[PDB]
From a paper:
Tom70 is one of the major import receptors in the translocase of the outer membrane (TOM) complex that recognizes and mediates the translocation of mitochondrial preproteins from the cytosol into the mitochondria in a chaperone-dependent manner. It contains an N-terminal transmembrane domain and tetratricopeptide repeat (TPR) motifs in its cytosolic segment. The C-terminal TPR motifs recognize the internal mitochondrial targeting signals (MTSs) of preproteins, and the N-terminal TPR clamp domain serves as a docking site for multichaperone complexes that contain preprotein. In line with this, the mitochondrial outer membrane protein Tom70 (encoded by TOMM70) is a high-confidence interactor of ORF9b in both SARS-CoV-1 and SARS-CoV-2 interaction maps, and it acts as a host-dependency factor for SARS-CoV-2.
Further, upon coexpression in bacterial cells, we were able to copurify the ORF9b-Tom70 protein complex, which indicates a stable complex. Using cryo-EM, we obtained a 3-Å structure of a region of ORF9b binding to the active site of Tom70. Obtained cryo-EM density allowed us to build atomic models for residues 109 to 600 of human Tom70 and residues 39 to 76 of SARS-CoV-2 ORF9b. ORF9b makes extensive hydrophobic interactions at the pocket on Tom70 that have been implicated in its binding to MTS, with the total buried surface area at the interface being quite extensive—~2000 Å2. In addition to the mostly hydrophobic interface, four salt bridges further stabilize the interaction. On interaction with ORF9b, the interacting helices on Tom70 move inward to tightly wrap around ORF9b as compared with previously crystallized yeast Tom70 homologs. S53 contributes two hydrogen bonds to the interaction with Tom70 in this overall hydrophobic region.
Residue numbers in the entry:
A (entry chain B): 39 to 76
B (entry chain A): 109 to 272, 298 to 600
Write the structure that this text describes.
């Protein structure tokens, strides 16, 4: 797959940092899964 | 004759192109273009794209560009001409025109061809960084949410700043946060009784505001100053080690995080912030060992036991051992029954469940977090992002994240998320507005460069929608 920088939030709950690490993948699919592209 | 002479002239181009005789090849393609029977609707676009290929070998990037444009005007879905024109744009530093041509190519290839995808990603990163550095020079020093600052300082146990600068401490406990920098700046230029730690309180609020360039001299002084409490020296190395990670300098970051554990070996905050970093770098085995050292120093802590359990889940999950993955899953319920008010136990467990596709159980764990803390806006965001995975029901995904934005209008994770929903709905103008609302809450160039890649892909699909 793609590789992204480790964009730390400062002193945040580890669940929030693991959530930003996930949203990068939903952003990747969002531009392929859209009506303009289909 | 009429078609045959043009086809012959194309192959007379091909023989000279194979010979590397590129001028003679261009003359034969120019013969084909002159000889073509346009009244028969011959596919003249192919002669122009063939002519354009030879001008890459001569590296006349304006000529390959304009001969691809001739092919595209005759034949608007011809992928070879669009991709060759994109490469020519990149060489001419026409990055925006490259992005629009590669966006059309990705769409017309169904995103399958990874040569197109690599050029899109590179050009988006360069466009991203150029927009990011010019905005980041001009940003507001925007103070984050009070819920965020209280959650932040609740991460540091073994720290003279958090536990109880002497003027500044009043405004921390009264939450007048925008005063803190001003007091620390006059408690420096005084005796070490104030100065030696006013530096580190000031350096902490520069980091919270995203002003990392102003943080680095106040940290560098605190390391260099010999008489200051060893726990400030260790705490400053956590904050320098983190600053280097925003700069993506992992070797310099690692050197500081090791010096902290050499300098003050009986300090939980050093192993806590090392543990949280090592598990984001996916160096999982070092994270488990540093979280275990947090429990050794804080055995009564609910958070330390939640975190070590998530680290053993990530260790099993970077493996593929089903027995170890299932053992780690039960480990979160053992944490929850021991610590039934541990909100981060439910949030981390919900993410292990989310990741194991157990969406309906994960959703209940996010409800339990709302019962335990109604002010936690990010749970409505983790519940909204769950909808985007839980058979993608985008309609109610908006409603959840709208409620999240209403609880805390500074949650940049909420705006960035709802931007991707508006993208999946095709509503690109409102997606770009959501990403702009996230950009106005970024803390670094590294974050703005990522959000501007999203705006530029949304613009490029808006321009391809016309074509």
């Amino acid at each position: 797959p793609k590789v992204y920088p480790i964009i730390l939030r400062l002193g945040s709950p580890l669940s929030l940092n693991m959530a930003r690490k996930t949203l990068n993948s939903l952003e990747d699919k969002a531009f392929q899964l859209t009506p303009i592209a289909v | 004759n009429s078609l045959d002479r043009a086809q012959a002239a194309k192959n007379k181009g091909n023989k000279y192109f194979k010979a590397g005789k590129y001028e003679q090849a261009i003359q034969c393609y120019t013969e084909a273009i002159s000889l073509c029977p346009t009244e028969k609707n011959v596919d003249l676009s192919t002669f122009y794209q063939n002519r354009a290929a030879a001008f890459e070998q001569l590296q006349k990037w304006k000529e390959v560009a304009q001969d691809c444009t001739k092919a595209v005007e005759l034949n608007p879905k011809y992928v070879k001409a669009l991709f060759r024109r994109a490469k020519a744009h990149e060489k001419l530093d026409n990055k925006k025109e490259c992005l629009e041509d590669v966006t059309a190519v990705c769409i017309l290839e169904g995103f399958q061809n990874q040569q197109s995808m690599l050029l899109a990603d590179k050009v988006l990163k360069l466009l991203g960084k150029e927009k990011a550095k010019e905005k980041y020079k001009n940003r507001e020093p925007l103070m984050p949410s009070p819920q965020f600052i209280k959650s932040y300082f609740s991460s540091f146990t073994d720290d003279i700043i958090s536990q109880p600068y002497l003027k500044a401490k009043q405004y921390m406990e009264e939450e007048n946060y925008d005063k803190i920098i001003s007091e620390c700046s006059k408690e420096i230029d005084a005796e070490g009784k104030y100065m030696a730690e006013a530096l580190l309180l000031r350096a902490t609020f520069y980091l919270l505001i995203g002003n990392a360039n102003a943080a680095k001299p106040d940290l560098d002084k605190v390391i260099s100053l010999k008489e200051a409490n060893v726990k400030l020296r260790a705490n400053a190395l956590i904050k320098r080690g983190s600053m280097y990670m925003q700069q993506q300098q992992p070797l310099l970051s690692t050197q500081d995080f090791n010096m902290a554990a050499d300098i003050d070996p009986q300090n939980a905050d050093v192993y806590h912030h090392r543990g949280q970093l090592k598990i984001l770098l996916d160096q999982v085995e070092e994270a488990v060992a540093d979280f275990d050292e947090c429990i050794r120093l804080r055995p009564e802590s609910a958070l330390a036991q939640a975190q070590k359990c998530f680290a053993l889940y990530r260790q099993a999950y970077t493996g593929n051992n089903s027995s170890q993955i299932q053992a780690a899953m039960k480990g979160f319920e053992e944490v929850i029954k021991k610590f039934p008010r541990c909100a981060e136990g439910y949030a981390l467990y919900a993410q292990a469940l989310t990741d194991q596709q157990q969406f309906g159980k994960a959703d209940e764990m996010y409800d339990k977090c709302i019962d335990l803390e109604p002010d936690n806006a990010t749970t409505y965001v983790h519940k909204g992002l769950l909808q985007l995975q839980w058979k993608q029901d985008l309609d109610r995904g908006l409603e959840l994240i709208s409620k999240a934005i209403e609880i805390d209008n500074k949650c940049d994770f909420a705006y960035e998320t709802m931007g991707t929903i508006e993208v999946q709905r095709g509503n690109m103008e409102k997606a770009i507005d959501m990403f702009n609302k996230a950009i106005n809450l970024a803390k670094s160039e590294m974050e703005m460069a990522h959000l501007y890649s999203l705006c530029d892909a949304a613009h490029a699909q808006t321009e391809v929608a016309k074509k």
